[PDB]
Write a protein that binds this DNA or RNA. Structure first.
Length: 88
RNA sequence: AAGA
């Protein structure tokens, strides 16, 4: 599953890119105050779900990234995550 | 789900 992991990784890094975050109000409203989102929320997004429903594979894809960081079941952008959360 |  290494090729599939790479596509998943890059898709999720797009969601956490500054360019996306500047317009992604839904994602920002779902963040906690520290920027964290449930990984299973990201797994539901259409372009990730198309690729896989394997949660281990999604976690493995994210562990490979220098854009995001995982803590338990949650993920956030590594750089300045606190700037992005928004009121629900 | 205008790549939530």
């Amino acid at each position: 599953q290494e090729l599939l992991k790479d596509y998943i990784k890059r898709q999720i890094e797009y969601y956490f890119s500054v360019d996306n975050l500047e317009r992604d109000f839904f994602l920002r409203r779902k963040m906690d105050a520290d920027g964290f989102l449930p990984i299973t929320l990201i797994a539901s997004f259409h372009r990730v779900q198309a690729l896989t429903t394997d949660i281990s594979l999604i976690f493995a894809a994210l562990k490979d990234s220098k854009v995001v960081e995982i803590v338990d079941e949650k993920v956030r952008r590594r750089e300045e995550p606190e700037k992005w959360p928004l009121p629900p």
